[PDB]
Amino acid sequence: DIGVASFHGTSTVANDKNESATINNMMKHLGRSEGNPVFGVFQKYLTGHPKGAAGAWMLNGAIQILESGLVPGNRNADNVDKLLEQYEYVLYPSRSIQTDGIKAVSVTSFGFGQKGAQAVVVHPDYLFAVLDRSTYEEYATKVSARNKKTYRYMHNAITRNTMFVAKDKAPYSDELEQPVYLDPLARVEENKKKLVFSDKTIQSNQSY
Amino acid sequence: GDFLRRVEERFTSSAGTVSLLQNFNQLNEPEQFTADFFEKFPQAGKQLISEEDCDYFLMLAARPGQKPVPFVPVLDERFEFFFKK
Amino acid sequence: QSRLKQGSLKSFIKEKEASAVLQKELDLWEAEHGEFYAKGIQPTFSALKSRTYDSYWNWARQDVLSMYFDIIFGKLVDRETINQCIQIMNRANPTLIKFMQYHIDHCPEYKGETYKLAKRLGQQLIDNCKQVLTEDPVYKDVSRITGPKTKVSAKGNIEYEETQKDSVRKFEQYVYEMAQGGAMTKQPVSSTIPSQTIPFLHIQKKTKDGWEYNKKLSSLYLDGLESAAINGLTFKDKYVLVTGAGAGSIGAEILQGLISGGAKVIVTTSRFSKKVTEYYQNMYARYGAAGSTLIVVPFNQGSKQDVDALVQYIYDEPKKGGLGWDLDAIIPFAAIPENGNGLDNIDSKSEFAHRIMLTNLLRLLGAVKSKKPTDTRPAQCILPLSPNHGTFGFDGLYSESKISLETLFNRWYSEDWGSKLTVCGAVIGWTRGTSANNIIAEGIEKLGVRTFSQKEMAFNILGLLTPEIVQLCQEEPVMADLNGGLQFIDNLKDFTSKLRTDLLETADIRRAVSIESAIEQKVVNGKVMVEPRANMKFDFPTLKSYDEIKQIAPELEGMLDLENVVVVTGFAEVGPWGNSRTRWEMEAYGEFSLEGAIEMAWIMGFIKYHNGNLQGKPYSGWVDAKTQTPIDEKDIKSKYEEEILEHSGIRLIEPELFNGYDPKKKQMIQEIVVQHDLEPFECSKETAEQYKHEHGEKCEIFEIEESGEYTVRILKGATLYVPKALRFDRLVAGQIPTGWDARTYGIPEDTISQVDPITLYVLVATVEALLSAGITDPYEFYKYVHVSEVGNCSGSGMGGVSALRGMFKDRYADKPVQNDILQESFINTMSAWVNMLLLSSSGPIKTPVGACATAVESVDIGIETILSGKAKVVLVGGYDDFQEEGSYEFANMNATSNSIEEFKHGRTPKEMSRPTTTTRNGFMEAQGSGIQVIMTADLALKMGVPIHAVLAMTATATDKIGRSVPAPGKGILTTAREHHGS
Amino acid sequence: QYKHEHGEKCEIFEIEESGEYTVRILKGATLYVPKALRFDRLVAGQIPTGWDARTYGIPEDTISQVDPITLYVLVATVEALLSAGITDPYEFYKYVHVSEVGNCSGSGMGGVSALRGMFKDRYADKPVQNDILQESFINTMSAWVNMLLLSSSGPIKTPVGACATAVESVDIGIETILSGKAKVVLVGGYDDFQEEGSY
Amino acid sequence: QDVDALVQYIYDEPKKGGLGWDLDAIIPFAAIPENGNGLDNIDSKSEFAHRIMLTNLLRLLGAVKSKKPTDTRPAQCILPLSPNHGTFGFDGLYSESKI
Amino acid sequence: NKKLAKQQLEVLARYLQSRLKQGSLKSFIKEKEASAVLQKELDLWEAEHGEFYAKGIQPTFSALK
Amino acid sequence: NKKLAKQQLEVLARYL
């Protein structure tokens, strides 16, 4: 069910060889069916290589791959290395292909200093089946409302150039900062159209 | 009708198509026409007004040489102008 | 002194007269030949610019999956499907067989009749590929035989369309009608040819004088065509050199057929570019069969240097930089179109085109012959002969070149290159481009003669590359009249002009009558389209029905601790293609939609939203930035697409985005000891005292009694630093789109000035990720969570590079630098500022460092933080910035790709990053930030945020003992751990 | 290079006798004269004078290639393992898989000597190793610790916290152990004193 | 340039330095002998000779045509065709020019 | 010693006359690289066509001849 | 102008 492998894919001779090798070896040791390669996403072909944000961009791409079902192809894959035919459990598409659903994506990053890292991301549909119907309907209604709020805020701020709204003040005053902290059940409430902490909602028997 | 044209433009998928409201006279029975319009665009019934369309609505309400609308759309600085005119 | 004041002026005037001599020599050559012939002979070919395609093993699976999902979604049983099946069969190998077997034996049929169709077609194709196992790859053209047809609408509009012939559907029936011939041209297809009738495609035998139609050779050729049509045609072990095979030409279809049959083809392109490279790439990906190899080379057939260099490259061994190939066929179809050039208009263009078509062609053949010492492997030269030598109008030297190519038939005998080259002169007939002649194609066809498609002509020539015609050419030069009976038309030019003028005199009169009838109606009698605009949404994950989700997943209800299940609730980017949305559009589609284009223009500051009065008229919408004029949403794309793509993604490093950093002018300073002391300069008291402190006795300071300021004399033996510059090898980076500003997202200028651009990217990405999670207000976390459970586990690998450069270099230079630059240099100060500006959480705050693999490590630390109970919500991710010194050090260790070597190889910035590619030579450095808001599943459900996915696993690992820091290793194999000796 | 930088504000000429070039820095050219200032901070908590990595046995190849913060890390890691009684660092693997020996230590600004190299010595065109950036990273200390001593493939975390990074390293190590990712982990922190950081 | 200059000189009137003649016949028999030049020996000499025999011949004809505004006095171009187009041996581009 | 005295006096007089010692040498090297540019253009053409085709295209015709 | 000429001459004689 691991359909896509978001490769580090740095267009480096050692990196794309070693990474394909480890992905193939792990897929083979995990008893993956023969003739079932993981599709290779190589997002760095388009986005370049940010050292810090490499895995982050690849995870965001894997998120979007899970949502949409599309596996982007490495459009700079002029000619796949012949040495990578070695790896039967890896496929290297060069054109984006729309799939009927991707269950999971394996994001793999390799950093300088002998620092490999792997993340496995699974589709939300397998989370939504571990909860009863009524919880699902409540969740879906809440997300519908929130998507409406988000649509508004995004359009408000994209035109008015107020995407980032710096917080001038913390939700707690300097006077209430320490009760607010000192109560683990402290939670902000709406006051003056802002979510702030109040003396009444701190160390309250109602919260407990 | 201008608001309906704006909704058409908002929810057409980057494709210039035939306007449902080709002329204003067919809006004389607006319930059925609005129904057909928002069946063409079902997502407009679930999407809140994008604020570009909100500002367009506000300047439509404030369009001069037009009968002022029978409602207050906003409570900004020009609230007296909407309330008393 | 014994010096000459004017010696170097003498040398200058001497060199000026020498330059004049060279200039008048060049001007004489130029007036002799002309500017077209002049700038047409430049060297285009370069051995390092050659592009190899041989990964048919990969492309087979790629095309298999493409077709599989197309049928699964009903986008595709049909001839194009059968053609793709032929290609997949041509690439069939045991691994591919196992691949299709898995994907079909595990195709669920219950999902729909469409899935049942995908399955059964897959079983049929698996059987076909199993049968094809171990046998050769065959070029089998299965496209429907299309014919010309022109319709003049009653409004006078001429419309030409290629429409399937009623009596001919397959290439088998095409060959049958070729054998049958026509009224004008008067078990195998040998027995089909009518007596005293010349088939349209035939081979002419040379009598004791000229060339005449021959029955036996024509029957052999048509039988070869029939065999190719029914069984296909293998070109394995055929090394071809094809020129003039660009898109929309006969040569391109020839290349498609050769590479389908398994040939190893060197394709020439006179216009080498990324577009042409991608065209040949996907042509190999479609048609490149088992054993095929496509070598795309830049090449000018107008230059003998290019001809010799290409032939040398083909025949040189791989150790010497060549291909080590011995050509089996040559197809020099490269030509220059010359129209309106009569005898009096024979010009530089005509002479140059003649050179390409004849002289450099003969030179190419001669170079191949000179390179071959073997006499047992001739190269088959497919000469593009024409049936019309001057009969048509103003074509320059085209007819001269075409008729001159006919001398090779006699030169095959008269000279000693017979054993090295064989002559196959294909008299190519009327071929339909796929335009001025296409409208009269139907008229010329109606009289019995016929007109070919590019695919049909390519099929004819590829059949001329049959083994039977190959040996026929070896023993005897072949003249293949592929003219479709046009030779039997008296006064072809006059008939053609009559047809075209009749068609034009019909269409134009119909149009004029329609126009004037419309005007008459308007005199007697005295729909509005919708204007699209951006429908930008965020598209939270589509929440499906509970019944259908429980159908997806088994009875898993009430099993997982959702508090211990972590989920991505939000995410965002700041990268070379804007944010996550625009980057994803460019990734999955390669082009921006309307929403993508408007978003890119907005982030890049091409457009800004205007509300209120604009030139008096009330306007509410996007306006230009530099001109403030209205821009309709369609004109957003139409006006900003080219600039968005030019200034987004991987591109040349722009010094305006990196404080004037020009890699071509990389500034350095060199220590020099002053040999002759400098003249005084004036500075302040403290500056002079600092100079005396540094230089000791190697400088002097003196107070000016008039002004009170000090003057500094840098004595002999002092050291100073003279700036110097070097051309830096790396010129290209994955930079954030030009015009990207933090003000566009709304970060105050106070924050922009005090805080560094990496942190600005982090702030924008964190805001976008929270509002991707639907968190309009970041304090809304605290309505469900304690302030001590909102963490920030993101971190950079080297973040704060701009501040590091400040403190380490600008401070050394005494430039204005903020007192707290070190504060901004820390890798954790980005997360600090994120908390101070947005969250105000007291939750766990981790800042990983991982160089390239820090964002996944941030995710891992976030999972650990949430699962330990220290947090419920955490911001994970990673960020870095591109700067001069980081780029220079990545170049020192040969980690980044050398852009100069890439340009030597002909690569552009848009194709510089080549993951998992044969010729990849280092990574492409980029900049930006990427943030994800990850949460517990229970909390995500409680707050109703969009659960984008589930972080089922995250882990980090190290490799082993070594002495190579940047070397990757198999350490992260520690995520697949099991004993096999449940 | 001088002509490239200074444009028309300098002249270069080949000496026909020797073949080398002579550079004349014309009027209006910019040059950088060294100057010195008395810095307010004269006192630091420095490692004792005569402290050498050779005294602990780190080869001169490592001392030359790798930066002094990392030498301190290596000495401290060896001393900590043998404080734990781990004479041989591979003795972890007699009880634990190579995937469960982590290193969650990290610096706040580690690699400052390499940062100074790349940012200033490189600008001055002084001899600097081609791989100084790899030594400038904050995780390269743990990388070298693993490459020289442990050979583990366990979880590898490199916290940054400026002053409060060693306690954060301990916190990440507790999390790593309690999540099952590791059984043993090296937690701590390190920094070096240098001119620019002090300033 | 020689072709154009000679044609200009022929068709220019005596006052302007030419001959003031309208050509009734053209006999371009100028050729360069090229022997031992096969397909592999096609060289600068072969291309130059081909230019003389074909390309500048066509340019001479075209220049005469451009100079003639009259349509009632054609020039008879006696083209030196050959019966042997490549049948004989190593002649460079001679057969190509003739055909 | 004296030669250096004399050089420095010479450059000084140039300074105050507002004269440039190396200006015409600058012009010479500029013209030399221009000549190299023209020579490489001519060399490319020549290697593209050959010496025979090169020296065969000279102007022979002259109306006065 | 001339004074600067002369200052340069002057320092020159000093130098050598």
Q: What is the DSSP string of C866-914?
A: HHTTS-SEEEEEEEE---HHHHHHHHHTT-B--HHHHHHTT--GGGT--
Nearest CB to G8 within list F1, F5, F16: F16
Chain E residue with minimal CA distance to C414?
A: E89
CB spacing of C947 vs A162 below 8 angstroms: no
Number of other CB atoms surrounding residue C311 within 10 Å: 24
Q: Round to whole Å and give the CA distance between C847 and C829.
A: 9
Q: Round to whole Å and give the CA distance between A170 and C839.
A: 8
Residue in the block written with tokens 């009632």:
E72
| Contact (Cβ atoms closer than 8 angstroms) between residue C878 and residue A59 | no
Nearest-neighbour CA in chain C from D62: distance (Å) = 9
Nearest-neighbour CA in chain E from F54: distance (Å) = 8
Q: Which residues of C touch B56 (CB under 8 A)?
A: 620-621
Q: Is F18 on the interface with G (CB under 8 A)?
A: no
Nearest-neighbour CA in chain B from C623: distance (Å) = 13
CB spacing of E62 vs C408 below 8 angstroms: no
Half-sphere exposure of C258 (CA within 13 A, CB side): 29
Q: Measured at the alpha carbon of residue C380, what is the angle toward residues C374 and C383, in degrees to the nearest 5?
A: 140
Helix or strand holding residue D21 (H, E): strand D21-25
Number of other CB atoms surrounding residue C155 within 10 Å: 12
Q: Round to whole Å and give the CA distance between C913 and C907.
A: 10
A8 is catalytic: yes
Angle between helix C113-132 and helix C79-90 axes, rounded to 10 deg: 40
Q: Is E44 on the interface with F (CB under 8 A)?
A: yes
Q: Round to whole Å and give the CA distance between C795 and D151.
A: 25
For residue A41, what are its two tokens? 């996403």
Q: Which residues of C touch B13 (CB under 8 A)?
A: 532, 535
CB spacing of D153 vs C695 below 8 angstroms: no
Q: Give how far Cα C215 sits from Cα of C69, C221, C375, C478, C864, Å.
A: 49, 10, 30, 14, 83
| Contact (Cβ atoms closer than 8 angstroms) between residue D143 and residue C851 | no
- Neighbours of C, requiring at least 3 CB pairs below 8 Å, are A, B, D, E, F
Q: Give how far Cα C881 sits from Cα of C574, C762, C804, C805, C847, Å.
A: 11, 10, 12, 12, 16
CB spacing of A114 vs D147 below 8 angstroms: yes
Q: Measured at the alpha carbon of residue C308, what is the angle toward residues C305 and C309, in degrees to the nearest 5?
A: 80
Number of other CB atoms surrounding residue C839 within 10 Å: 26
| Contact (Cβ atoms closer than 8 angstroms) between residue C972 and residue C955 | yes
Chain D residue with minimal CA distance to F20?
A: D26
Residue in the block written with tokens 């001169």:
D60
| Contact (Cβ atoms closer than 8 angstroms) between residue D129 and residue C929 | no
The three-state secondary structure class of C267 is strand
Please tell me what resolution, in angstroms, this structure has.
2.6
Q: Round to whole Å and give the CA distance between C409 and C406.
A: 6
Q: Which residues of C touch D37 (CB under 8 A)?
A: 690, 693
Backbone angles phi, psi at E41, to 5 degrees: -105, 10
CB spacing of E5 vs F60 below 8 angstroms: no
Q: Round to whole Å and give the CA distance between C572 and C574.
A: 7
Q: Round to whole Å and give the CA distance between C309 and A2.
A: 49
CB spacing of E87 vs C351 below 8 angstroms: no
CB spacing of A147 vs C922 below 8 angstroms: no
CB spacing of B9 vs C609 below 8 angstroms: no
The three-state secondary structure class of E75 is coil
CB spacing of B55 vs C611 below 8 angstroms: yes
Facing residues of C792 across strands?
Answer: C845, C875
Where would I find the beta strands (DSSP E) of A28-67? 38-41
Backbone angles phi, psi at C51, to 5 degrees: -120, 125
Q: Round to whole Å and give the CA distance between C970 and A9.
A: 15
Helix or strand holding residue A23 (H, E): helix A13-29
Number of other CB atoms surrounding residue C917 within 10 Å: 26
Residue D56 makes CB contacts below 8 A (sequence gap 6+) with D74, D75, D78
Nearest-neighbour CA in chain F from C42: distance (Å) = 8
Residue C95 makes CB contacts below 8 A (sequence gap 6+) with A35, A88, C57
Q: Round to whole Å and give the CA distance between C511 and C867.
A: 77
Residue in the block written with tokens 């490189």:
D122
Number of other CB atoms surrounding residue D96 within 10 Å: 15
The three-state secondary structure class of C381 is strand
What are the residue numbers of the active site of D? 163
Q: Round to whole Å and give the CA distance between C781 and C784.
A: 6
Nearest CB to G4 within list F4, F9, F16: F16
CB spacing of A148 vs B52 below 8 angstroms: no
How were these coordinates obtained? cryo-EM
Nearest CB to B9 within list C531, C609, C618: C531
Closest CA to C81 of C41, C89, C720: C89
Q: Round to whole Å and give the CA distance between C889 and C884.
A: 9
CB spacing of B50 vs A148 below 8 angstroms: no
Give B39-43 contacts, CB < 8 A, sequence gap 24+.
Answer: B41/B7, B41/B8, B41/B11, B43/B11
Chain B residue with minimal CA distance to C529?
A: B18
Buried b (16+ CB within 10 A) or exposed e, C577-615: bbbbbbbbbbbbeeebbbbbbbbbbbbbbbbbbbbeeee
Task: For an interface test with E, give the residue of F48, F55, F61 to mutate (most E CBs within 10 A).
Answer: F61
Backbone angles phi, psi at E82, to 5 degrees: -125, 150
Q: Round to whole Å and give the CA distance between B43 and A30.
A: 44
Closest CA to C492 of C443, C436, C457, C431: C443
| Contact (Cβ atoms closer than 8 angstroms) between residue A115 and residue C496 | no
Sign of torsion, CA D164 D166 D169 D171? negative
Got the DSSP string for E13-46? Answer: -GGGTS-----SEE---------SB-STT--HHH
Q: Can chain B be said to touch chain C, i.e. do they have 3 or more Cβ pairs within 8 angstroms?
A: yes
For residue D20, what are its two tokens? 């080398």
For residue B10, what are its two tokens? 């908002």
CB spacing of A116 vs C744 below 8 angstroms: no
Facing residues of C202 across strands?
Answer: C481
Q: Which of residues 1-16 of G touch F (CB under 8 A)?
A: 1, 4-5, 8-9, 12, 15-16
Q: Round to whole Å and give the CA distance between D145 and D166.
A: 16
Number of other CB atoms surrounding residue C502 within 10 Å: 12
Q: Is C394 on the interface with E (CB under 8 A)?
A: no
Q: Measured at the alpha carbon of residue D86, what is the angle toward residues D82 and D88, in degrees to the nearest 5?
A: 110
| Contact (Cβ atoms closer than 8 angstroms) between residue C91 and residue C126 | no
Q: Round to whole Å and give the CA distance between C177 and C717.
A: 96
Nearest CB to E85 within list C345, C410, C417: C410
Count CB pairs under 8 A between chains E and F.
Answer: 32
Q: Round to whole Å and give the CA distance between A104 and A120.
A: 7
The domain that holds B64 is classified in CATH as 1.20.930.70
Residue in the block written with tokens 């211990």:
C564
Chain F residue with minimal CA distance to E5?
A: F61
Q: Round to whole Å and give the CA distance between C249 and D146.
A: 60
Chain B residue with minimal CA distance to C613?
A: B59
Provide the residue range defining the domain that includes B22. Answer: 1-74
Task: For an interface test with C, give the residue of B9, B18, B22 to mutate (most C CBs within 10 A).
Answer: B9
Q: Which of residues 115-174 of D touch C (CB under 8 A)?
A: 115-116, 118-120, 122-125, 130-140, 143-144, 146-148, 150-162, 168, 171-172, 174
CB spacing of C343 vs E85 below 8 angstroms: no
Q: Which residues of C touch B50 (CB under 8 A)?
A: 536
Q: Round to whole Å and give the CA distance between C351 and C354.
A: 5
Residue D140 makes CB contacts below 8 A (sequence gap 6+) with A112, A113, C965, D70, D111, D134
